[PDB]
Design a protein around this ligand. Structure first.
Ligand SMILES: Cc1cc(O)nc(O)n1
Ligand SMILES: Cc1cc(O)nc(O)n1
Ligand SMILES: Cc1cc(O)nc(O)n1
Ligand SMILES: Cc1cc(O)nc(O)n1
Ligand SMILES: Cc1cc(O)nc(O)n1
Ligand SMILES: Cc1cc(O)nc(O)n1
Ligand SMILES: [Cl-]
Ligand SMILES: [Cl-]
Ligand SMILES: [Cl-]
Ligand SMILES: [Cl-]
Ligand SMILES: [Cl-]
Ligand SMILES: [Cl-]
Ligand SMILES: [Cl-]
Ligand SMILES: [Cl-]
Ligand SMILES: [Cl-]
Ligand SMILES: [Cl-]
Ligand SMILES: [Cl-]
Ligand SMILES: [Cl-]
Ligand SMILES: [Mg+2]
Ligand SMILES: [Mg+2]
Ligand SMILES: [Mg+2]
Ligand SMILES: [Mg+2]
Ligand SMILES: [Mg+2]
Ligand SMILES: [Mg+2]
Ligand SMILES: [Mg+2]
Ligand SMILES: [Mg+2]
Ligand SMILES: [Mg+2]
Ligand SMILES: [Mg+2]
Ligand SMILES: [Mg+2]
Ligand SMILES: [Mg+2]
Ligand SMILES: [Mg+2]
Ligand SMILES: [Mg+2]
Ligand SMILES: [Mg+2]
Ligand SMILES: [Mg+2]
Ligand code: NA
Ligand code: NA
Ligand code: NA
Ligand code: NA
Lengths: 251, 252, 247, 248, 252, 252
């Protein structure tokens, strides 16, 4: 069978039922090459797709683009082609003083500051990961030697006002989001990103297994501009971790 | 030095406890406490019966919540004022999936917020999620008891009747919001209904408290057969054995 | 035949079609003994049930527990057993400076700060008492010599943040409820409690008659935490209101 | 002193009135005023016609509201600026219960807020509830007139057509929110539909003003969609007697 | 043959008109009608005064709406039942932007739905948007008059007082939703407040009817100076001249 | 050097451009740029490919948005930080009206906000509407190309599948909110579906930026999902010529 956007067929996946889904198309090859026999399948729009083999089993690596909407297309179309387990890796900004740049976060639930999640389940439904995937991600992250936090992630449809950034063209933030950083901090939320609410809600309500692991590249209470060597090390460890989490999920 | 308004206990009464087991039914409090060492009755007011006990040398509180988020929210708050930081809920549930059997255990990984009290702690966007350590301890304890364990989403309703799409009622009416809702939750993979977890999990996850929920399955909306009496007795006993073992794992 | 939670049958109620529904199971016997031939029927969880006779007619007294959810179960199961009129009594915190401890309030409508009401009617629907019950409660309260206020009650699913209390473990209140006590005060709301929105909405949308009378035990302009007489007077009033509802 | 922006009257014009009767139709204002003593025309602008009269020696205002919450909210606000504290709404209505007959009276004990203006005074959780004294006076006046009187909940809609689930319309369609709504309100025991009570009652109950509504039934929606003389005449006699009871 | 319930007119009374000019004030109806040929009084009931006239030989209806979406919705519906398909709203307005002057005209490109009646036609997500041809005709007519014309967003409120964040009122109270709202709309570029456009535009755009709104500015929430009688008289007269010219441009 | 977080370009790179053409697909950026003078590649990062070109002597930037409001919102914000004030969206769309044929063009006059990002700029009541000059320019350019052009409302969804009521999916399920929604939008006169306009139009209209959307119809949902290749190619080629001519009209 074919799909509308991803440009791959079921045959291209060689029986893969697990996908690693980074955001950045450029990260796809980097992840694939941590496994055996990486093969470029397709690139169209924000969707770059590779296959590789992990302990003899086919695994697909597919970028999502930025945001719930583009993520939702990739997950749906991969599911049409037989994928049932989705491991999200990406970078994130921490909002708690105790979470340091270079730490890792495994999301136990997401604050749904998105729109696409509502296209799968009403707001009352929890944006939570599959327990096996979260468990595998925690184990892989801890085994790497990283400092790992389990907790709630705020997942926003914007990078700017929905994360209460004021250093912008207008410098304004709509009422809903004024004072919101402080509120999430007080409620113990660890970090911000832009895809987990959609991913987790879609999967948890559709019989798909999903989880999210992230490297902390900035801390909002500190500075916006990351140090290059620190960022590189964090990014490299994250992709090693997500591949090990995939290994733990294979049956 | 204060005595909290509803529970009628003081901090000193808890002998340093930082963990509470919180069943719904006041009559179950003594039953849980007696699985531990040196159980002592502290107080009973309204739906709140409170005992203390000792588990591997550490003080633990057992406190009933009553039915529903509102009465649960009072117990959790007043215990937190007195130093309790971890809350392990144990209780009965009805399953709504055919693959879940009477006698099985469910550990909630997140709750559908069909309640009102959760909104008094966090807006609806916030996830009603357990602490990961508590959920992990509950899964391990449940598996070690020999039970079949399901991890998944629980629908947490402010009513027993229309919010669980029951029609066998005085009016036989279910408001628009809840018509067809059972099938919707079933199709979304929800395991069960109960009436306190959304409040508990949202309150704790947004307030720096650790919480989780484990439940023995005593009825299944999709199975017409009458649950076996012996199985029910065994399930009640196993549930509370499991929650005490989960507490042991949290205090280690 | 025997309802799921309350542990009583229709026969146990001896034809009663009116219930007095306090919150605390311990107050059930106290109310029943204000009437004739009180009989203990059952106790389970927060639900203690008695029957008694008032001017020769059977009346039920049944506790609700705290909150809309446990209240909704009691009302439903009593209705299954033939009860059609529900008189809520309890205590409350006033938020207006002119409403004093010891005064009584009869709710004319509730601010729906609960969840269970939404399981019976959408938010647009008014949480309002049956007019005959409200009329009987006002008459009973006034005839007792009490100072009586008719007005709006804020009915909250929490005792703490939803009533904008800050002497709490977190010492914080979510955005929705920050500044809310002053807002309700400005809007003329009289008091806070925790069951009326559920009770009134459920009954007004289900062909049941309900109302709420409450004795004031704290004024929130004075302090947050409450410290016998007000309770005793309140239950005498609700029994007289029941007398007025009997046909 | 000031002349209010829309109503075109001053506080002095009202001769100390603290109670207003507020029908919808400007043409009804003189008809209500003439049931009292010394009626005098004060002003007419847009849908707002204003008279003063005397009832048992006390000044009373009669002021039309126009159709809907928005125009009602202006009249109530401006009258309150000029000292009015009690508002008695009279009008006609469509019943949705089969046992409520044309010619019956309804006194609203609470309104379903199917309007927008109520939200400009209180959030949706707040009850659209009358003042208890006004509702009590209206019930007594209605009964004393010999009318069959119903106390209960009224659905108060910002539209006459889709919000009252009428289908004999240009589009013949009703938006999702209102499809099946008449049956739902019927099942919930709602008595009737009209268009101003949610705004009036919410505004007043949240602003330290006393308000109530009484209405004569001119159609039963179990019978037909499209709808009077004797019902209107009896309704205004009733509201004037309710006013008398409030001034005593 | 039927006579519509509120407006008190029949289809035959409209003499084939498919376009209506809909001012708010019943007293303005005759004034607009007299700008055209052969004006004829049809009916007056409540806030609804109805005239017919002829514009370049074609029948045009002029019908007042009263204040607010609810009364407007009745007029539009009943006129549509009688064959009217195009609705041109005219009035005068204040403005909330300092660059908009008394005497300028505003053509609404979209409305902030601070009303209730719009929701009786379409859910809140739906845009309160004019028909493009009507908006185009109104802009052309307004500009041809020599006035400075602003195309932009209008805030359409179910109240004159709290929904426009007015504090000079009986209570001085503005509910939370509307506290700080004026500044918010100003910062978002909203031009003005009025009380009917959200209902009108949403109703029509979701019902196969063509609608638009044009207004002369009579006050500005942000300027010190008070406009003189002459400017206001000129603005009122220009607004109705403009709407009649917009009608001319819409005729086929 | 003024820099931005995602786009990888500086203000200097844009050579004073105040207008951007913003297609969805990065591959379409060079195709649009080459219709103008001196196109130069600036950067490519993630879904964002950026070129500069010159149109009648004025610098213009072409920048892809990616799929969806969230990625669109980043591009628009960062371009605005670098001085861009006018945004012309071009793309493809699926029509839902039987009278709107494959190969026609649509200029959006307002969007149904079935997205989340719009709410991060303005509450739901605010209209997702284009700048009137941009919409006018797009209509003229589209007409001048010989296309059949429709002006009207567009449904703008955060999903391609359930939010557009597609059932031929992995689960075959559509959440309650969206069941029956296609028919509802059809009945309300909505022309088409796409996934970025609600965010774009709301963000810009509430932030002092001018925006509009023009689209070629590549499928009609009442017909078939699989486009014919030659027809699609013709439609896509015409759309990019049209958006460049609309830009010319805006800069005149
Ligand atoms: C990397 C990153 C940082 C940040 O602050 N927010 C989001 O969404 N992503
Ligand atoms: C035990 C049980 C069963 C059921 O179906 N629902 C709830 O809340 N509890
Ligand atoms: C007795 C009481 C007092 C108070 O302040 N609030 C509630 O809910 N109950
Ligand atoms: C008179 C009347 C009748 C009816 O059915 N609805 C409304 O609003 N008014
Ligand atoms: C004339 C005018 C002015 C203003 O400020 N608001 C409304 O609705 N109308
Ligand atoms: C091209 C296209 C077609 C369609 O049906 N929907 C969306 O969003 N885009
Ligand atoms: Cl990434
Ligand atoms: Cl229990
Ligand atoms: Cl009590
Ligand atoms: Cl009643
Ligand atoms: Cl006190
Ligand atoms: Cl009238
Ligand atoms: Cl009839
Ligand atoms: Cl006018
Ligand atoms: Cl006439
Ligand atoms: Cl249009
Ligand atoms: Cl594109
Ligand atoms: Cl091309
Ligand atoms: Mg602000
Ligand atoms: Mg799952
Ligand atoms: Mg005690
Ligand atoms: Mg239904
Ligand atoms: Mg936590
Ligand atoms: Mg705050
Ligand atoms: Mg009733
Ligand atoms: Mg008697
Ligand atoms: Mg027809
Ligand atoms: Mg429908
Ligand atoms: Mg009052
Ligand atoms: Mg405030
Ligand atoms: Mg249209
Ligand atoms: Mg055709
Ligand atoms: Mg065709
Ligand atoms: Mg359905
Ligand atoms: Na994207
Ligand atoms: Na309870
Ligand atoms: Na209709
Ligand atoms: Na009006």
């Amino acid at each position: 069978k074919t799909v509308f956007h991803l440009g791959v067929t079921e045959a291209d996946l060689n029986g893969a039922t697990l996908a690693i889904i980074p955001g950045d198309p450029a990260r796809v090859q980097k992840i694939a090459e941590l496994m055996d026999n990486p093969v470029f399948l397709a690139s169209h729009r924000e969707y770059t797709v590779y296959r590789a083999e992990l302990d003899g089993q086919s695994v697909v690596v597919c970028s999502t683009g930025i945001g719930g909407p583009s993520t939702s297309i990739a997950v749906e179309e991969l599911a049409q082609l037989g994928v049932r387990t989705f491991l999200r890796v990406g970078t994130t900004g921490a909002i708690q003083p105790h979470v340091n740049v270079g730490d890792m976060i495994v999301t136990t639930g997401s604050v749904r500051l998105d729109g696409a999640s509502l296209h799968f389940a009403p707001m009352e439904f929890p944006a939570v990961p599959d327990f096996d995937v979260a468990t595998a991600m925690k184990a892989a992250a801890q085994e790497s030697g990283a400092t790992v936090h389990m907790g709630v992630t705020a997942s926003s449809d914007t990078f700017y006002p929905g994360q209460e950034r004021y250093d912008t063209f207008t410098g304004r933030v709509v009422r809903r989001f004024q004072g919101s950083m402080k509120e999430w901090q007080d409620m113990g939320v660890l970090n911000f990103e832009m895809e987990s609410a959609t991913l987790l809600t879609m999967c948890a309500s559709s019989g798909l297994k999903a989880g999210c692991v992230a490297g902390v590249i900035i801390n909002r209470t500190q500075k916006e501009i990351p140090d290059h060597a620190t960022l590189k090390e964090t990014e490299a460890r994250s992709i090693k971790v997500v591949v090990e989490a995939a290994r733990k999920m294979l049956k």
